[PDB]
Amino acid sequence: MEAIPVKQFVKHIGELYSNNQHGFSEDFEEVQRCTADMNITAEHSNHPENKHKNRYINILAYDHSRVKLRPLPGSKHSDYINANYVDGYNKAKAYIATQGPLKSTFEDFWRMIWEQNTGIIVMITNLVEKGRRKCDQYWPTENSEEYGNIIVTLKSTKIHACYTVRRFSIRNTKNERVVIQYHYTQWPDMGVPEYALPVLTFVRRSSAARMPETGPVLVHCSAGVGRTGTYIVIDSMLQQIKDKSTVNVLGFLKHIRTQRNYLVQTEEQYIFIHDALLEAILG
């Protein structure tokens, strides 16, 4: 609820960790339950003609907040993509949280990017992790690839230790637009990163790349809820800290849980959010 000053927040983290992290567990259970008295419809997600457009049968996109594609002539559900607008700090629809694109949704994905005037992609998964496919490669390995009316050209890549930055040019056939992809490459197969610092750097730089004024930042991992939620909360709280030197993780999280299911999927991620914010404050 109430935003608290950084100094108070910093001590509250220590509070949350104490007694075997009892506070962290209480908070997250509160998060888990915070929509129990809410019936939030996701009819489009669950429509049979949309089934193949969902990477997970049980990860849905709430109707009220879903990103709609302009309808295509010919069908009646060409409007659907498994993606939701999510608020950021003091800004509605700061993000589009979505699943890792499927081959079957590559065209929908880039069309969304074009239609929403998105200039930054944040990708927080490897395509394959421990042998399991997590995301399909929706971009060109080199030069150009065509997805529907959108042609995407890879212009440059910088490969850092923990993330990769790919600059693309995209254009609609009816090099018009620049799109920058920040692709984190070191998230562990299981659990959360052992050190927050690389993640903080990734978030700061990817967030700094957001140009005034453009469409929402697209954020995705595999399901578009866990790491994606974690990114959104960290970025937003860093924003709030920088702007007001207050923070409200629990309040903000319970709010965005209304906009896409399961954002910040585990207690461990919820804890990592704090570990990362503590280091940012101390740095």
Coordinates of N, CA and C in Angstrom, one line a residue, residues 126-232:
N126 N 16.8 -17.9 -22.8 CA 17.4 -18.5 -23.9 C 16.4 -19.3 -24.7
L127 N 16.6 -19.5 -26.0 CA 15.7 -20.2 -26.9 C 15.5 -21.6 -26.3
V128 N 16.6 -22.2 -25.9 CA 16.6 -23.6 -25.4 C 17.3 -23.5 -24.0
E129 N 16.8 -24.1 -23.0 CA 17.4 -24.1 -21.7 C 17.3 -25.6 -21.2
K130 N 18.5 -26.1 -20.8 CA 18.6 -27.5 -20.4 C 17.8 -28.4 -21.4
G131 N 18.0 -28.2 -22.7 CA 17.5 -29.1 -23.7 C 16.0 -28.9 -24.0
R132 N 15.3 -28.1 -23.2 CA 13.9 -27.8 -23.4 C 13.7 -26.5 -24.2
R133 N 12.8 -26.6 -25.2 CA 12.6 -25.4 -26.0 C 11.7 -24.4 -25.2
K134 N 12.2 -23.1 -25.1 CA 11.6 -22.1 -24.3 C 11.0 -21.0 -25.1
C135 N 11.6 -20.7 -26.3 CA 11.2 -19.7 -27.2 C 11.7 -20.0 -28.6
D136 N 10.9 -19.6 -29.6 CA 11.4 -19.8 -31.0 C 12.1 -18.6 -31.5
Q137 N 13.0 -18.8 -32.4 CA 13.8 -17.6 -32.9 C 13.0 -16.8 -33.9
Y138 N 12.5 -15.7 -33.4 CA 11.5 -14.9 -34.1 C 12.3 -13.8 -34.9
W139 N 13.6 -13.8 -34.8 CA 14.4 -12.8 -35.6 C 15.4 -13.5 -36.5
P140 N 16.0 -12.7 -37.5 CA 16.9 -13.2 -38.4 C 18.3 -13.5 -37.8
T141 N 18.9 -14.6 -38.1 CA 20.3 -14.9 -37.7 C 21.2 -13.9 -38.3
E142 N 21.0 -13.6 -39.6 CA 21.7 -12.5 -40.3 C 20.9 -11.9 -41.4
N143 N 21.3 -10.7 -41.8 CA 20.6 -10.0 -42.8 C 19.1 -9.9 -42.5
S144 N 18.3 -10.3 -43.4 CA 16.9 -10.0 -43.3 C 16.0 -11.2 -43.4
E145 N 14.8 -11.1 -42.7 CA 13.8 -12.1 -42.8 C 12.4 -11.4 -42.9
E146 N 11.5 -12.1 -43.5 CA 10.2 -11.5 -43.7 C 9.1 -12.2 -43.0
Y147 N 8.4 -11.4 -42.1 CA 7.2 -12.0 -41.4 C 6.0 -11.3 -41.7
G148 N 5.2 -11.8 -42.6 CA 4.0 -11.1 -43.1 C 4.5 -9.9 -43.8
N149 N 3.9 -8.7 -43.5 CA 4.3 -7.5 -44.3 C 5.5 -6.8 -43.6
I150 N 6.0 -7.4 -42.6 CA 7.2 -6.8 -41.9 C 8.5 -7.5 -42.2
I151 N 9.4 -6.7 -42.8 CA 10.7 -7.3 -43.0 C 11.7 -6.8 -41.9
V152 N 12.4 -7.7 -41.3 CA 13.3 -7.4 -40.2 C 14.7 -7.7 -40.7
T153 N 15.6 -6.7 -40.4 CA 17.0 -6.8 -40.8 C 17.9 -6.6 -39.6
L154 N 18.8 -7.6 -39.4 CA 19.8 -7.5 -38.3 C 20.9 -6.6 -38.7
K155 N 21.1 -5.5 -38.0 CA 22.1 -4.5 -38.3 C 23.4 -4.7 -37.6
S156 N 23.3 -4.9 -36.3 CA 24.5 -5.1 -35.4 C 24.2 -5.9 -34.2
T157 N 25.2 -6.5 -33.6 CA 25.0 -7.3 -32.4 C 26.2 -6.9 -31.5
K158 N 25.9 -6.7 -30.2 CA 27.0 -6.7 -29.2 C 26.7 -7.7 -28.2
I159 N 27.7 -8.6 -28.0 CA 27.5 -9.8 -27.1 C 28.3 -9.6 -25.9
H160 N 27.6 -9.2 -24.8 CA 28.3 -9.0 -23.5 C 28.3 -10.3 -22.8
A161 N 28.9 -10.3 -21.6 CA 29.0 -11.5 -20.8 C 27.7 -12.1 -20.4
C162 N 26.7 -11.3 -20.1 CA 25.4 -11.8 -19.5 C 24.2 -11.4 -20.4
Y163 N 24.4 -10.6 -21.4 CA 23.3 -10.2 -22.3 C 23.8 -9.8 -23.6
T164 N 22.9 -9.8 -24.6 CA 23.2 -9.5 -26.0 C 22.3 -8.4 -26.5
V165 N 22.8 -7.4 -27.2 CA 22.0 -6.3 -27.8 C 22.0 -6.5 -29.3
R166 N 20.8 -6.6 -29.9 CA 20.7 -6.7 -31.3 C 19.9 -5.5 -31.8
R167 N 20.5 -4.8 -32.8 CA 19.9 -3.7 -33.4 C 19.3 -4.2 -34.7
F168 N 18.0 -4.0 -34.9 CA 17.3 -4.3 -36.1 C 16.8 -3.1 -36.8
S169 N 16.6 -3.2 -38.1 CA 15.7 -2.3 -38.8 C 14.5 -3.1 -39.3
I170 N 13.3 -2.5 -39.0 CA 12.1 -3.2 -39.5 C 11.4 -2.2 -40.4
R171 N 10.7 -2.8 -41.5 CA 9.9 -2.0 -42.3 C 8.6 -2.7 -42.8
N172 N 7.6 -2.0 -43.0 CA 6.3 -2.6 -43.4 C 6.2 -2.4 -44.9
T173 N 6.0 -3.6 -45.6 CA 5.8 -3.6 -47.0 C 4.4 -3.2 -47.4
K174 N 3.6 -2.8 -46.4 CA 2.2 -2.4 -46.7 C 1.5 -3.6 -47.2
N175 N 13.5 0.1 -44.5 CA 14.2 0.3 -43.2 C 13.6 1.5 -42.4
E176 N 12.3 1.5 -42.3 CA 11.6 2.6 -41.7 C 11.9 2.8 -40.2
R177 N 11.9 1.7 -39.4 CA 12.0 1.8 -38.0 C 13.1 1.0 -37.3
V178 N 13.8 1.6 -36.3 CA 14.8 0.9 -35.5 C 14.1 0.2 -34.3
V179 N 14.5 -1.1 -34.1 CA 14.1 -1.8 -33.0 C 15.3 -2.5 -32.3
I180 N 15.5 -2.2 -31.0 CA 16.6 -2.7 -30.3 C 16.1 -3.8 -29.3
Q181 N 16.8 -5.0 -29.4 CA 16.5 -6.1 -28.6 C 17.5 -6.3 -27.5
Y182 N 17.1 -6.2 -26.2 CA 18.0 -6.6 -25.2 C 17.7 -8.0 -24.7
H183 N 18.7 -8.9 -24.9 CA 18.5 -10.3 -24.7 C 19.3 -10.8 -23.6
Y184 N 18.8 -11.0 -22.4 CA 19.6 -11.5 -21.3 C 19.8 -13.0 -21.5
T185 N 21.1 -13.4 -21.4 CA 21.5 -14.8 -21.8 C 22.0 -15.6 -20.6
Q186 N 22.0 -15.1 -19.4 CA 22.6 -15.8 -18.3 C 21.7 -16.2 -17.2
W187 N 20.4 -16.2 -17.4 CA 19.4 -16.6 -16.4 C 19.5 -18.1 -16.2
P188 N 19.7 -18.5 -15.0 CA 19.9 -20.0 -14.7 C 18.8 -20.9 -15.1
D189 N 19.1 -22.1 -15.5 CA 18.1 -23.1 -15.9 C 17.1 -23.3 -14.8
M190 N 17.6 -23.2 -13.5 CA 16.7 -23.3 -12.4 C 17.0 -22.2 -11.3
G191 N 16.0 -21.7 -10.6 CA 16.2 -20.7 -9.6 C 16.4 -19.3 -10.2
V192 N 16.9 -18.4 -9.5 CA 17.1 -17.0 -9.9 C 18.6 -16.8 -10.0
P193 N 19.1 -15.7 -10.6 CA 20.5 -15.5 -10.7 C 21.1 -15.3 -9.3
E194 N 22.4 -15.9 -9.2 CA 23.1 -15.8 -7.9 C 23.5 -14.4 -7.6
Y195 N 23.8 -13.6 -8.6 CA 24.2 -12.3 -8.4 C 23.3 -11.3 -9.2
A196 N 22.8 -10.3 -8.5 CA 21.8 -9.4 -9.0 C 22.5 -8.4 -10.0
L197 N 23.7 -8.2 -9.8 CA 24.4 -7.0 -10.4 C 24.3 -7.1 -12.0
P198 N 24.6 -8.2 -12.6 CA 24.4 -8.3 -14.0 C 23.0 -8.0 -14.5
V199 N 22.0 -8.5 -13.7 CA 20.6 -8.2 -14.0 C 20.3 -6.7 -13.9
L200 N 20.8 -6.1 -12.8 CA 20.6 -4.7 -12.6 C 21.2 -3.9 -13.8
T201 N 22.3 -4.3 -14.3 CA 23.0 -3.6 -15.4 C 22.1 -3.7 -16.7
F202 N 21.6 -5.0 -16.9 CA 20.7 -5.3 -18.0 C 19.5 -4.4 -17.9
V203 N 18.9 -4.3 -16.7 CA 17.7 -3.5 -16.6 C 17.9 -2.0 -16.8
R204 N 19.0 -1.5 -16.2 CA 19.3 -0.1 -16.3 C 19.5 0.3 -17.8
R205 N 20.3 -0.5 -18.5 CA 20.7 -0.1 -19.9 C 19.5 -0.3 -20.8
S206 N 18.7 -1.4 -20.7 CA 17.6 -1.7 -21.5 C 16.5 -0.6 -21.2
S207 N 16.3 -0.2 -19.9 CA 15.3 0.8 -19.6 C 15.8 2.2 -20.1
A208 N 17.1 2.5 -20.0 CA 17.6 3.7 -20.5 C 17.4 3.9 -22.0
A209 N 17.3 2.8 -22.7 CA 17.2 2.8 -24.2 C 15.8 3.2 -24.7
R210 N 14.9 3.3 -23.8 CA 13.5 3.7 -24.1 C 13.5 5.1 -24.6
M211 N 13.0 5.4 -25.8 CA 13.0 6.7 -26.3 C 11.7 7.4 -26.2
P212 N 11.7 8.7 -25.7 CA 10.5 9.5 -25.7 C 10.3 10.1 -27.0
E213 N 9.2 9.8 -27.6 CA 8.2 9.0 -27.0 C 7.6 8.0 -28.0
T214 N 7.6 6.7 -27.5 CA 7.3 5.6 -28.4 C 6.3 4.7 -27.8
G215 N 6.1 3.6 -28.4 CA 5.2 2.6 -27.9 C 5.7 1.9 -26.6
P216 N 4.9 1.1 -26.0 CA 5.4 0.4 -24.8 C 6.6 -0.6 -25.1
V217 N 7.4 -0.7 -24.0 CA 8.5 -1.7 -24.1 C 7.9 -3.1 -24.1
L218 N 8.3 -3.9 -25.1 CA 7.9 -5.3 -25.1 C 8.8 -6.2 -24.2
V219 N 8.2 -6.9 -23.2 CA 9.0 -7.7 -22.3 C 8.5 -9.2 -22.4
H220 N 9.4 -10.1 -22.6 CA 9.0 -11.5 -22.7 C 10.1 -12.4 -22.2
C221 N 9.7 -13.6 -21.7 CA 10.6 -14.7 -21.4 C 10.1 -15.9 -22.1
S222 N 9.8 -17.0 -21.4 CA 9.1 -18.1 -22.1 C 7.6 -17.9 -22.0
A223 N 7.0 -18.0 -20.7 CA 5.6 -17.8 -20.5 C 5.2 -16.3 -20.4
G224 N 6.1 -15.4 -20.3 CA 5.8 -14.0 -20.2 C 5.2 -13.6 -18.8
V225 N 5.5 -14.4 -17.8 CA 5.0 -14.1 -16.4 C 6.1 -13.9 -15.4
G226 N 7.0 -14.9 -15.3 CA 7.9 -15.0 -14.2 C 9.0 -14.0 -14.2
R227 N 10.0 -14.3 -15.1 CA 11.2 -13.3 -15.3 C 10.6 -12.0 -15.8
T228 N 9.6 -12.1 -16.7 CA 9.0 -10.9 -17.2 C 8.4 -10.0 -16.1
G229 N 7.7 -10.6 -15.2 CA 7.2 -9.8 -14.1 C 8.3 -9.3 -13.3
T230 N 9.4 -10.1 -13.1 CA 10.5 -9.7 -12.2 C 11.2 -8.5 -12.8
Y231 N 11.4 -8.5 -14.1 CA 12.0 -7.3 -14.8 C 11.1 -6.1 -14.6
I232 N 9.8 -6.2 -14.8 CA 8.9 -5.1 -14.7 C 8.9 -4.4 -13.3

